Design a protein around this ligand. Structure first.
Ligand SMILES: Cc1nc(-c2ccccc2)nc(Sc2ccc(F)cc2)c1C(=O)O
Length: 133
């Protein structure tokens, strides 16, 4: 029952400062423009200890499956090859991606009927809000 409140199908309803977050990450112009337009569907499911997060969009579809605390390989929407670890900290999913000596942290939290995603790359935060689809 660890992620019960995250499970489901979610749709992006708002975004703030995502272009700047992507600039800090190192995303190029064209990918920032097209990725920034996307209105992804996030589908979160749990089967035993394995959590799956799928993102479906017009630009790219992504999928990760993982066990909490156990590092894995991820290919991001912008085609970075990263080493990721996802943990639960006080009811917040905390996702750290490492690549090329860089790091970004993505936090996912339930707040009211929303799933709030906070993405941080050095000093820059983007906040992305999802509602149930
Ligand atoms: C945390 C995050 N990072 C990035 C992301 C995207 C590009 C470069 C770096 C990071 N995208 C998304 S959602 C998304 C999925 C597919 C897509 F084609 C566009 C957006 C999210 C999200 O969870 O809201």
């Amino acid at each position: 029952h660890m992620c019960d409140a995250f499970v489901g199908t979610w749709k992006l309803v708002s975004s703030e400062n995502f272009d700047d977050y992507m600039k800090e990450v190192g995303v190029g112009f064209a990918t920032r423009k097209v990725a920034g337009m996307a209105k992804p569907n996030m589908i979160i499911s749990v089967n035993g200890d394995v959590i799956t997060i799928k993102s479906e969009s017009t630009f790219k579809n992504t999928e990760i499956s993982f066990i909490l605390g156990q590092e894995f390989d991820e290919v991001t929407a912008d085609d970075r090859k990263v080493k990721s670890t996802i943990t639960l900290d006080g009811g917040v999913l905390v996702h750290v991606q490492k690549w090329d000596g860089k790091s970004t942290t993505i936090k996912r939290k339930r707040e009211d009927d929303k799933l709030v995603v906070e993405c941080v790359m050095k000093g820059v935060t983007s906040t992305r809000v999802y509602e149930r689809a």
